[PDB]
Amino acid sequence: GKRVLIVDDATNGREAVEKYKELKPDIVTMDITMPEMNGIDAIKEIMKIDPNAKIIVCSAMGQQAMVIEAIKAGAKDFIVNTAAVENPSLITQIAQTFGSQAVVVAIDAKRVDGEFMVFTYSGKKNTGILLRDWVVEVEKRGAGEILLTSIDRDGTKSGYDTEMIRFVRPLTTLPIIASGGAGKMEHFLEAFLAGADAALAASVFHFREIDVRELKEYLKKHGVNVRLEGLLEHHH
Amino acid sequence: GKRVLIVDDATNGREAVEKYKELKPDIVTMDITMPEMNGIDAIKEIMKIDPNAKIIVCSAMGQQAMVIEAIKAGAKDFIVNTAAVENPSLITQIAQTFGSQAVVVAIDAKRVDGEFMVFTYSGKKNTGILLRDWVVEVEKRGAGEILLTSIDRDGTKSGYDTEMIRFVRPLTTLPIIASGGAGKMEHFLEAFLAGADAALAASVFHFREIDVRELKEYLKKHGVNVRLEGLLEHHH
Q1: Minimal Cβ distance to B36: which of A14, A151, A206
Q2: Which of B70, B42, B233, B235 is nearest to A34 (CA)?
Q3: Contact B12 A203 (CB under 8 A)
Q4: Are A117 and A128 spatial neighbours (Cβ–Cβ below 8 Å)?
Q5: Within 13 A of B193's CA, how many CA atoms are on the CB side?
Q6: Breaks (C-N over 2.5 A) in chain B follow
Q7: How many distinct structural domains can be found in chain A?
Q8: Which residues of B touch A123 (CB under 8 A)?
Q9: What is the torsion angle, in degrees rounded to the nearest 10, for the CA atoms of residue B169, residue B173, residue B177 and residue B179?
Q10: What CATH number should be reported for the domain holding residue A172?
């Protein structure tokens, strides 16, 4: 690409096999955690109504029991955050089975005392690990793509963390999907200019702050390659 | 009180009827949304192992179908956020059935252009409604307590929004549980001093930034009344 990711996030269903065919999206993402809500049962139906893919499983943590059963259903790809920080090897582990392609590492970052630092458990434990460090590590461990979310920007509807991107950019060769403060059409350009290979966004379209057709034409009128895709997800 | 609320948040279970007896807490909170995860089935077991209470149901939105069944199980109290903003009457509605006591209105606030504004859908739609307005409205509609969460502070581990509290304080007589940036022992005092009748916190204890025994003694050594309680919750 790049590469703009339009998200529909629904939700605890059920509201999947219904939304999937009616929205023909390029991902989905599936939270499967704890053996209670029809995660695995959902996938099978898709892997039927469309034998292809592309489902990305949300593995973390300790409920691997489910992940295994999910892969038996046809799951080929995964994102990881906390469980990779606990155990960096877990990446190499997957990447060896399914290839580097198959693994995306989500990274949650926040600047503390003028220093980019990593945060886990849905962005709350300050790991005391410099972002700069983890980035390199993650690549060497065998990642595919980095899902850099800026906490200092997440939900500020005030722009992507173009600074955090630039910081990460030269430290890697891997694609970088950028996440955080999607605010206006202009903000997407800045992200691409920073280095981000992809931009993710939910709130702006959901609430029609921004028109997806218009955003395509805007970026087109500036000479950018895109390429926009449909995400889809349960749960939190 | 006041009044400090220690939260254990677990999680999609199941990890309830096990945690409840072993943790003897004063709340719980129960997310029941969509007929899939054992919300209602959980309550019944408690309402058995302890016929008393005190369960607070998380009603919102449109899945009232479940809420009704939940009340049949013995639910007496509720919190509301988005669905109250959509339909202010919904408060009067509950408060008439179960009394003003029974209803807590969560308010999500963020300052925009030097103006406290309300946000819905897990804090993302700018309602274009001044906090000052909703506060009064909510009381007149028949609320019991206000669960003021500061977005500009939520997860900053940098102090409560002592400014937002002071703003709300004189506009009401209702109790105010304060939520947001629980950072250090000192930060709890400031909150109480601001007007907050209660402080809620999860991250600080979970990750043992702060010791609960120590926090009691700290506030005691400053002459405060407390009074600390155990929350417990699924899910997001």
Answers
A1: A14
A2: B235
A3: no
A4: yes
A5: 13
A6: none
A7: 1
A8: 155
A9: -30
A10: 3.20.20.70
Tokens of B15: 């990890």
Residue B210 contacts residue B4 (beta carbons within 8 Å): no
Q: Do B14 and A33 touch (CB under 8 A)?
A: no
Residue ranges making up the domain that contains B104: 1-236
Its sign, for the CA torsion B110, B115, B120, B125, is negative
Query: Do A199 and A5 touch, CB atoms closer than 8 A?
Result: yes
Residues of B in contact with A235 (CB under 8 A): 235-236
**Contact map slice: B 31-70 vs A, CB within 8 A:** 33-34, 36-38
Residue A196 DSSP symbol: -
Neighbours of A222 (CB within 10 A): 12
* The two structure tokens encoding residue B190: 């400031």
In Å, what resolution does this model reach?
3.1
Which experimental technique did the depositors report for determining this structure?
A: X-ray
Task: Tell me if B155 and A151 make a contact (CB, 8 A cut-off).
Answer: yes
Q: Are B31 and B60 in contact (CB under 8 A)?
A: no
- Which of the residues A8, A18, A34 would you substitute to probe the B interface, choosing the one with the greatest number of B C-beta atoms within 10 Å? A34
State which amino acid sits at residue A173. T
What are the tokens at A36? 């209670």
